[PDB]
Amino acid sequence: NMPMTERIRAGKLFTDMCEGLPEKRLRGKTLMYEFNHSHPSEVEKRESLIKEMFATVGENAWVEPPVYFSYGSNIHIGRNFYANFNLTIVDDYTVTIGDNVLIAPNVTLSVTGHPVHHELRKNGEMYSFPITIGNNVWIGSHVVINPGVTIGDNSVIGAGSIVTKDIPPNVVAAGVPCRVIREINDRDKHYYFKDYKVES
Amino acid sequence: NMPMTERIRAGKLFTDMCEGLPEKRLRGKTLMYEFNHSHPSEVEKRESLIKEMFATVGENAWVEPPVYFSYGSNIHIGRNFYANFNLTIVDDYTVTIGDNVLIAPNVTLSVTGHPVHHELRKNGEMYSFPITIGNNVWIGSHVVINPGVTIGDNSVIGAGSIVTKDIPPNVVAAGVPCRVIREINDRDKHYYFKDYKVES
Amino acid sequence: NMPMTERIRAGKLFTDMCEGLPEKRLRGKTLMYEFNHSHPSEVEKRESLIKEMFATVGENAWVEPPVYFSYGSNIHIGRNFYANFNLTIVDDYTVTIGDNVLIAPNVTLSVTGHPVHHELRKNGEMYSFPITIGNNVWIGSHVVINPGVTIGDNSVIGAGSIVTKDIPPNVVAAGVPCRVIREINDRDKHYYFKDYKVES
Numbered sequence: 212n213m214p215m216t217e218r219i220r221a222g223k224l225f226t227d228m229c230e231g232l233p234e235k236r237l238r239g240k241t242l243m244y245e246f247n248h249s250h251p252s253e254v255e256k257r258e259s260l261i262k263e264m265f266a267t268v269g270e271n272a273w274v275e276p277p278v279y280f281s282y283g284s285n286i287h288i289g290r291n292f293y294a295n296f297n298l299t300i301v302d303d304y305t306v307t308i309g310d311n312v313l314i315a316p317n318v319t320l321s322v323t324g325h326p327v328h329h330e331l332r333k334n335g336e337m338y339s340f341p342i343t344i345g346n347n348v349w350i351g352s353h354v355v356i357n358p359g360v361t362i363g364d365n366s367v368i369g370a371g372s373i374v375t376k377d378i379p380p381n382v383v384a385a386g387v388p389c390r391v392i393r394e395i396n397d398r399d400k401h402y403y404f405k406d407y408k409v410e411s
Numbered sequence: 412n413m414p415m416t417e418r419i420r421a422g423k424l425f426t427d428m429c430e431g432l433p434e435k436r437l438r439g440k441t442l443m444y445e446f447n448h449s450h451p452s453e454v455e456k457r458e459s460l461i462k463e464m465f466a467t468v469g470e471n472a473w474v475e476p477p478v479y480f481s482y483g484s485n486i487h488i489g490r491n492f493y494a495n496f497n498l499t500i501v502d503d504y505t506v507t508i509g510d511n512v513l514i515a516p517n518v519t520l521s522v523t524g525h526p527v528h529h530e531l532r533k534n535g536e537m538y539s540f541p542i543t544i545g546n547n548v549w550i551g552s553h554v555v556i557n558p559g560v561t562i563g564d565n566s567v568i569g570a571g572s573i574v575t576k577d578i579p580p581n582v583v584a585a586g587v588p589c590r591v592i593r594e595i596n597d598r599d600k601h602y603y604f605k606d607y608k609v610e611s
Numbered sequence: 612n613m614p615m616t617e618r619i620r621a622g623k624l625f626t627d628m629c630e631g632l633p634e635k636r637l638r639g640k641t642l643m644y645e646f647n648h649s650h651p652s653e654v655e656k657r658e659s660l661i662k663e664m665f666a667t668v669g670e671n672a673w674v675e676p677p678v679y680f681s682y683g684s685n686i687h688i689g690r691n692f693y694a695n696f697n698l699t700i701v702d703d704y705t706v707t708i709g710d711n712v713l714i715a716p717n718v719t720l721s722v723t724g725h726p727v728h729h730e731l732r733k734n735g736e737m738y739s740f741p742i743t744i745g746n747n748v749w750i751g752s753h754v755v756i757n758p759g760v761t762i763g764d765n766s767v768i769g770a771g772s773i774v775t776k777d778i779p780p781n782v783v784a785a786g787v788p789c790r791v792i793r794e795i796n797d798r799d800k801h802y803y804f805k806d807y808k809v810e811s
């Protein structure tokens with residue numbers, strides 16, 4: 212006897228078929244549908260749905276439909292946020308993105324997991340831990356960010372990464388599981404790609 | 412002497428632009444279309460389309476649109492099935508899923524593949540080997556399951572896994588390619604995440 | 612610096628909010644919307660759009676909706692092209708696909724990337740390097756192909772690989788990051804999958 216809602220915040224196992232959760236979900240997923248199916252020319256429309264879908268959205272935010280979430284109202288986005296096609300966020304709990312964050316296509320964030328033992332999840336039980344994307348972070352394509360992960364500022368996450376651990380700031384991380392490939396140093400102020408110098 | 416119908420069943424190479432296959436594909440993608448572009452409030456309709464779309468569906472099935480498949484009628488689902496956003500199932504041949512199966516967002520299932528040799532696929536020839544998912548299986552995000560793969564009951568597939576070989580029951584598997592990581596023991600019956608236990 | 616469209620062609624850092632780039636994108640995303648939302652029965656309309664969406668498309672092209680791209684007009688496709696669901700192509704610059712190329716579902720092609728050093732991207736500045744996919748290439752599901760990569764003729768990219776470097780022709784590459792597994796020999800002329808021969 213503890214409201215599901217309060218079990219989420221406590222990191223306890225819960226289910227979401229009650230206490231107004233389903234109604235919340237239908238509100239968000241309703242806005243999601245008119246965004247996702249809006250005509251590319253309906254820019255103002257899209258512009259308001261964004262402010263509308265997420266609990267928090269800074270200025271100069273852009274999201275290439277389609278976009279997917281469970282609620283929408285648990286996603287708090289910062290300034291100048293760009294997200295490319297198919298950004299999926301399972302926001303059963305807090306998801307926070309800093310400023311000037313760039314998100315490539317087909318990225319997946321999820322504060323939710325299921326107990327490994329199929330007996331702790333007989334009724335699709337879940338747990339939720341907040342994700343936190345720092346400022347000036349860049350996430351490559353097909354990246355997956357798992358429950359309770361924090362990505363430090365100005366860091367980069369390579370395409371295909373499966374982030375399962377916290378990622379410090381100022382690094383470059385990649386792999387399955389995602390691991391720190393390396394620190395970003397002055398050479399990166401000159402070389403922006405493979406063998407290409409900033410001064411051509 | 413053997414139709415393409417019999418070739419698929421036999422595991423032999425084939426092509427699907429005859430024997431009514433194309434027309435079969437159209438019927439399924441038509442219901443698929445209606446399902447994928449349905450309003451979140453069209454609850455009844457969504458439920459009826461599901462029992463329509465797939466060959467078999469057990470009680471309490473839930474698929475979060477959009478869903479993608481080739482025929483849909485080659486897929487058999489057990490009971491209490493929950494698939495999140497963008498489940499993709501290339502079912503040129505039979506796909507069987509058990510009960511209490513949980514599928515995270517952006518998961519691709521595929522019974523189909525193509526000869527490695529470009530000489531064998533001059534006309535895009537393929538082979539199809541059924542996929543079999545046990546009961547109480549949980550599949551992480553961005554996981555891909557290749558042709559003829561069998562996942563043993565109660566097993567867990569970590570996010571981003573690329574499954575090319577059969578997974579035994581009662582295991583936690585992950586990686587690229589997927590490798591059995593450990594056995595699911597009774598220590599999992601208390602712990603569900605890092606160091607979070609369960610009390611009375 | 613110098614004009615934005617030039618920086619592109621020169622592999623220099625650029626932003627795309629001028630020189631008519633946004634409008635160019637709107638026509639693209641417009642034809643894209645018309646394609647993605649078409650009905651499975653509207654085959655003739657789907658074919659006109661294919662020819663209209665991309666710069667060049669050889670005969671026999673088939674693209675299963677939905678398909679995603681930035682401009683569309685920066686894509687050149689050969690002949691007997693086949694792409695399954697959710698092909699995403701960030702064609703900020705040229706993307707060339709040869710003949711008899713088969714693409715599995717959920718593949719992402721991006722000629723664009725961002726300077727890893729945040730100071731070099733304050734205004735989400737990016738670079739773009741063409742992508743060249745040879746003839747008779749087969750790309751598996753959930754593959755990601757990064758900027759300026761060349762996939763040789765007759766090669767195969769396993770499901771889930773993250774292709775960061777060029778792939779030689781006649782090989783089988785897979786992995787994160789993608790690495791050459793072996794060369795396509797003549798045994799591949801008999802065995803097409805795990806242990807199945809052609810005549811026996």
Ligand SMILES: CC(C)(COP(=O)(O)OP(=O)(O)OC[C@H]1O[C@@H](n2cnc3c(N)ncnc32)[C@H](O)[C@@H]1OP(=O)(O)O)[C@@H](O)C(=O)NCCC(=O)NCCS
Nearest residue numbers: 315351352369370385386721723724727757773775787788
């Ligand atoms: C992360 C990235 C920018 C490269 O990091 P970088 O330091 O400048 O690149 P490097 O090639 O020097 O990386 C060094 C090593 O890491 C490997 N590596 C790079 N990216 C990797 C990735 N995503 N996953 C795994 N390994 C990766 C390289 O293959 C290389 O191998 P080696 O050490 O054996 O030689 C690039 O790999 C990438 O993924 N970009 C994302 C592109 C994208 O998704 N764009 C979308 C546009 S919005």
Ligand SMILES: CC(C)(COP(=O)(O)OP(=O)(O)OC[C@H]1O[C@@H](n2cnc3c(N)ncnc32)[C@H](O)[C@@H]1OP(=O)(O)O)[C@@H](O)C(=O)NCCC(=O)NCCS
Nearest residue numbers: 321323324373375387388515516551552569570583585586
């Ligand atoms: C599979 C999963 C549950 C972890 O298994 P677990 O046994 O409880 O986790 P562990 O951290 O103890 O795993 C042990 C090792 O495997 C690695 N690992 C875990 N998941 C991995 C994955 N998906 N791919 C590759 N490696 C993985 C860990 O990084 C760790 O590395 P180490 O041995 O060097 O220390 C987790 O990785 C995962 O993928 N969860 C899915 C969440 C999700 O998709 N939720 C959405 C539901 S709607």
Ligand SMILES: CC(C)(COP(=O)(O)OP(=O)(O)OC[C@H]1O[C@@H](n2cnc3c(N)ncnc32)[C@H](O)[C@@H]1OP(=O)(O)O)[C@@H](O)C(=O)NCCC(=O)NCCS
Nearest residue numbers: 521523524527575587588715751752769770771783785786
């Ligand atoms: C690439 C592919 C055809 C297999 O290559 P193949 O030579 O005939 O297969 P093999 O099993 O002999 O490959 C050898 C090794 O590479 C590994 N491997 C195969 N595919 C891999 C992949 N995609 N990523 C990483 N490793 C892979 C195998 O696990 C194996 O491991 P081992 O050397 O320890 O034994 C297959 O893995 C694949 O990815 N097919 C794509 C299927 C798909 O997406 N189809 C949809 C089409 S509509």
